[PDB]
Design a protein around this ligand. Structure first.
Ligand code: HEM
Ligand SMILES: CC(C)CC[C@@H](O)[C@@H](C)[C@H]1CC[C@H]2[C@@H]3CC=C4C[C@@H](O)CC[C@]4(C)[C@H]3CC[C@]12C
Length: 470
């Protein structure tokens, strides 16, 4: 017989007490640092009730592996209480992100065909490639601007525009010029909405939703706003683009996600609005943060920067073909992006509600218990990755002296991984080929940035990169 649940280490059955402590330690935004200290204290597995919210935490691959066995046919991750609250309170139509059960599966079948299938992928090359050339050119238009043949600065906001264009061009097939001299201000409103939503969710996560108006009056006003912006704006684009092909449509030429989901005819109207809103939202900061960190890391290690340049300039003068042909000749690059998600995951953890009881390590895990995967922490532990500080793309391809191998979880796993997984991977892969055949990025000084918890994980201080041609 396994050890009983209530026997899993934990810091105490008293949820409220733990919250006092959490709140006194200033843990609200260090929730990934605590993982690392908690596992160091309790060992491979532990519990921690905060108020009424209890969950188990794992870190060893073999466990994650096992836990996934019982995730189900229609899985279920943790549901952000503030996000969920806004929609129910306002009664806004939800999509894949909140959808539950066969209702959920229905949309995701459609959605895979249109954003994950390896022909809706090939149909993206042309939509994405050009947006990444336009970003090489914005950098070009800055090097010849500072005047001394280089560029110094924090390009984060350009990473946002880049990204928002990329997700808009693939869902709508029209360009927005967020990489122009003067960008759209209505589109900067939506972009800063998506990041305002995130940022204002943190203080709302460990407090009863229906108590927001008293213990969190301000943070709730702001988070409610940020969603409003997200909705109206995504709703606008969806109208003025429905009508962009509603009349003038006597030919062929893309995947227009908005179009395809109107032509496949496998989804009701109500949901396309909602799902598009959610996709649009997903492109804005995720790729941005990740791309930033990749560049950051390339500057931390030149020898690796050069190996990537060598393989990119090798699938150019040894493919002669366009971009399509060289996307299969760049393994180190793609692995580079996983080595990034390793060191800098967007998701601090992955969570699954087990369909049926199971046993982790040696403890009973009752079905329907929140179990969580310490992605951030697994990334930093030397018990899983030799010298976990080192940026080592070769981690994700050795396959010869490995007796064991684990797959990268930055995107999650199983049938309810990131539906935008594929779009993001290709979008970043192209941006880097272009950045790699054009600039030798560095950093002005010793780089020492650490991460901070803001729903998604972001770097804590601005990052200043240096681009120089070749
Ligand atoms: C580097 C970029 C990205 C990363 C790392 C990322 C990461 C992931 C993670 C870890 C999850 C939870 C996975 C799980 O439950 O197993 C998720 C959910 C999801 N993300 Fe992404 N994602 C990002 C890009 C995108 C893109 C561009 C979109 C929209 C196109 C977006 C929208 C989604 C949606 C809507 C789902 C929910 C899917 C579902 O529950 O069926 N994300 N993402
Ligand atoms: C509408 C958009 C928010 C879609 C964004 C999505 O592309 C992505 C960035 C989201 C969707 C699911 C999210 C997770 C939901 C719940 C967990 C547990 C929580 O305690 C920390 C955040 C964390 C780990 C979230 C990280 C951010 C994720 C991975």
């Amino acid at each position: 017989t396994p050890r009983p649940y209530s026997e899993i280490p934990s810091p105490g059955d008293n949820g409220w007490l733990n919250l006092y402590h959490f709140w006194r330690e200033k843990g609200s935004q260090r929730i990934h640092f605590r993982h690392i200290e908690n596992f160091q204290k309790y060992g491979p597995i532990y519990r921690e009730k905060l108020g009424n919210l209890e969950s188990v935490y794992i870190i060893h691959p073999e466990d994650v592996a096992h836990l996934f066995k019982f995730e189900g046919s229609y899985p279920e991750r943790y549901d952000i209480p503030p996000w969920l609250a806004y929609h129910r309170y306002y009664q806004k139509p939800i999509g894949v992100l909140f959808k539950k059960s066969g209702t959920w599966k229905k949309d995701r079948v459609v959605l895979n065909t249109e954003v994950m299938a390896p022909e809706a992928i090939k149909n993206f090359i042309p939509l994405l490639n050009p947006v990444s050339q336009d970003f090489v050119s914005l950098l070009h238009k800055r090097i010849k601007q500072q005047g001394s043949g280089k560029f110094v600065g924090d390009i984060k906001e350009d990473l946002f525009h880049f990204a928002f264009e990329s997700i808009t061009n693939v869902m709508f097939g029209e360009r927005l010029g967020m990489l122009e001299e003067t960008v759209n201000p209505e589109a900067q409103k939506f972009i800063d909405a998506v990041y305002k939503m995130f940022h204002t969710s943190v203080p709302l996560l460990n407090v009863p939703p229906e108590l927001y108006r008293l213990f969190r009056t301000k943070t709730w006003r702001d988070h409610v706003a940020a969603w409003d912006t997200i909705f109206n704006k995504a709703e606008k684009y969806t109208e003025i683009f429905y009508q962009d092909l509603r009349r003038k449509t006597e030919f062929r030429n893309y995947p227009g996600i908005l179009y395809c989901l109107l032509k496949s005819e496998k989804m009701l109207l109500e949901d396309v609005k909602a799902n598009i809103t959610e996709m649009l939202a997903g492109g804005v900061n995720t790729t941005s943060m990740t791309l930033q960190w990749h560049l950051y890391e390339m500057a931390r290690s030149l020898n690796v920067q050069e190996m990537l340049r060598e393989e990119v300039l090798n699938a150019r003068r040894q493919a002669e073909g366009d971009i399509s042909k060289m996307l299969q000749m760049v393994p180190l690059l793609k692995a580079s992006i996983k080595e990034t998600l390793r060191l800098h995951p967007i998701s601090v953890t992955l969570q699954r509600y087990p369909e049926s009881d199971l046993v982790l390590q040696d403890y009973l895990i009752p079905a329907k218990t929140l179990v969580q995967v310490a992605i951030y922490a697994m990334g930093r532990d030397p018990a899983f990755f030799s010298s976990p500080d080192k940026f080592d793309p070769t981690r994700w391809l050795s396959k010869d002296k490995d007796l064991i191998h684990f797959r990268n979880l930055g995107f999650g796993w199983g049938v309810r991984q990131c539906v935008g997984r594929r779009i993001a991977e290709l979008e970043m892969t192209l941006f880097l080929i272009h950045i790699l055949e054009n600039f030798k990025v560095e950093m002005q000084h010793i780089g020492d940035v650490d991460t901070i918890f803001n729903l998604i994980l972001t770097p804590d201080k601005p990052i200043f990169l240096v681009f120089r041609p070749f």
